[model samples]
Target: EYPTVSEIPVGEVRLYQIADGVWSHIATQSFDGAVYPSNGLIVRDGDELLLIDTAWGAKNTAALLAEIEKQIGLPVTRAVSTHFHDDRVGGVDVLRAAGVATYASPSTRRLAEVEGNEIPTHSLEGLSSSGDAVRFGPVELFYPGAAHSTDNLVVYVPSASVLYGGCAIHELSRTSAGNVADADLAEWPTSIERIQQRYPEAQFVIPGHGLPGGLDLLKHTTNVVKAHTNR
Candidate 1:
């Protein structure tokens, strides 16, 4: 069962401790009066913290950093954006100002530059294929093929057996693929399957939005993509 050890709200965002040393940050942003909540992951790494994605915007991300310092008492030294979307990298400037080393897949960086979004500072190159993962202390960033976005990636922590599936994996409650404007619909299911094969030990799977779950999240994402593709 997913038990939140602590819950803290800062402005339009909330932080939830989903696992030991692992927290999920959800920030709300409205698009044409429709408020959408975006999720990111924070993992403690020894004396520093690693962020999987940024809050919706710079202000919210700054708020998140302050809250992290107050509650966890650690500086965020590194961060990575799963994709180039604003929801994923909009707070890159805040991270840079705080001296945080920000990273993203080469394609993500290129896409961000092309789209005029805040781009990550470093590129996670050499990851040319699916299932190839790079280690960041206890955290692993894996590329599971093109799905939600061409450059979307996922984070996995073996110690906690938790996988931050990012936008590639949909939440259990989602009946449809939320945003596919930049998605490769035909390849999405295969990407989810590759994630399952790569991280079989993942007991808790966290999506880019909504709550966390188990392998069922992966299956549900595949089904959603397939349904979207078939229709």
Candidate 2:
């Protein structure tokens, strides 16, 4: 079980050890008068630690840093945003303040600029159209195309067969897609299908919110998107 960092404006912040050198950092978000938790990852490769995403904002991000150091016993060296949402990239400024190198996709950077949120220090592009594959130590960043946002990325650990679907995916608890205000509802299924095909061997599926499971989460998300498209 993970320790509780806090519960306030940001909701509950919890940490989970997904693998030997991998962790999941979750921060709660209030939507439609209900509390929902969003996830990020803390992965270690040798002596360096990298964050997939930080908590929602400064306070939560600080909590994340403390817990990470306390639990993992290493300073976070870098981070990457899966999208432009506040819950995903809101801690870009905080990480930078601590001298942590932060990265984001080009589309995500542009979107954050338009949204007036904290911007990333570096740009990580996907392998489609003037792109570069994002690889850090042992983790790989895969862009499954537009699903939750115009630039959503799934973090993968080939060694552990772990997939951090981020906001681009949803657990069975909140089965349907959460925030589609900036999503391609119709194409969401295709995006997730691409992920399923790319990482068919993924043993653990951790969505942006709710409980993590096996390959069934991918199937659930695809089916959920299909239903949303018709509605």
Candidate 3:
């Protein structure tokens, strides 16, 4: 039998099937006793799968992979990094070790090398850019400018009308820029504008952290960035 929607909580990792072929894996982290939640997306493309980002680190990612495998009964053949942050790339090493073809923009790789974070196994720069589109099976990966991180990327699955706005956009509940260590606040709104224009038909927008929502998530993120810039 094929996989159905399953919720498995392990340590700081939580998995939920958001759509027919899409899943969200939340990874929780703590800083000074304050807990934070980060998210990664999993998309089932036929018998294969596409993973966007990873859990916070190896242990959590291991649990995530187990859950995904149990549900899909398939291995993650390909993966991508939205940015160079640890929350995004921390488990990349495990994926690479498992022979997953991991990809990232040149900027993401460079930044990770500089920051000494785990790097992707391959580069997607030749196939895509800020406005360019690269098709991977049935999914699309686009770099709609930078907001959350310098090399932030947004993933779109046309069939599902789902957009994975990995840190580039905000969740509906977010009211401030969570982390801008490598963000372009001045150009943040512009980046989001391009996304809205590119995927105006996106039905569900998934953020790096927090719950997913409709296009309003993009609108709210745009306003939050503006407010932060104005202040």
Candidate 4:
């Protein structure tokens, strides 16, 4: 697993640098344990706060929310999933309970619809979409085709120039190649192009897991897809 963040300064806001603008819960540890990180993020867009992806545990997620709330009383408008992974969508329950609208790509919706409460399930059944803009706050849903998983919907905070890519692809600088093989090679390059064209000004990327980088993450993911798919 990638290095995780422990605690971030409230009000100061933790801006994870995943790829170009993708990010997830600040991972404090990994599947094996030993490592530590405070993954995920809460984007403050003016008066509203956008919680990109919740943490691994609901309790852990709540703690982060509390910490964030202490500094700012701005309402949490919504929550988004980078993909359908557990670590990325684990905190959906907490967000839903708090009355925040949840949004993800259509493919992820299909996965859950067919699987039936297997990947990510919420007590509340009504799922919300950003459409163009969420009613809760100032944010947009950006789906750059397909790259990481079959269902990958990145979140972009226009004001902050931050793109949250969940697990669309992991940075080699963060983990091993075999460990990051959940990619869909055939659609990778085209996906990168989609994201680039959609948000060309993304100066920072918050990856699902790893030290966030610049446009290189997009280029690297593109190469990985092309090399693997050869299509």
Total backbone collisions, model 4: 34
Candidate 2 regions off by >4 Å?
Answer: 1-12, 127-133
TM-score of 1: 0.93
Candidates ranked by TM-score, best first? Answer: 1, 3, 2, 4
Best by TM-score: 1
Question: Model 4 TM-score?
Answer: 0.72
lDDT for each residue of candidate 2 in 44-112, tens digit (9 for 90 to 100): 877988898878887778888877877788889889888888988887888999889999888888999
What are the candidates' C-alpha RMSDs? Answer: 2.6, 2.5, 3.6, 5.9
TM-score of 2: 0.92
Candidate 3 regions exceeding 4 Å error are 1-10
Candidate 4: worst-modelled 10 consecutive residues by lDDT: 123-132
Residues 1-231, candidate 1, lDDT per residue (tens digit)?
A: 332213323345567888899998888776775666778999989988998889879988988888788888898999999999988999999999999999998989999999999999988875658667888777888889899998889999888998999999898878999899999998888889889998888898999877788989999998989899888
Best by lDDT: 1
Give the alpha-carbon lDDT of every model. 0.86, 0.81, 0.82, 0.58
Residue 76, candidate 3: Cα error in Å is 0.7
Model 1 local distance difference test score: 0.86
| Tens-digit per-residue lDDT, 1-231, candidate 3 | 111113323344666777788888887766575666778888887888899898878888877788777766788998898889988899998898888998888889999999999999898864345677788776798888778876888899988899999888887777888888788998788889999999999998888877788999988999999888888
Q: Score residue 65 of candidate 4 by CA lDDT.
A: 70
Q: How does residue 133 of candidate 1 score in lDDT?
A: 82
Q: lDDT of candidate 4?
A: 0.58
How close to the true structure is residue 154 of candidate 2, measured as C-alpha lDDT? 88
TM-score of 3: 0.92
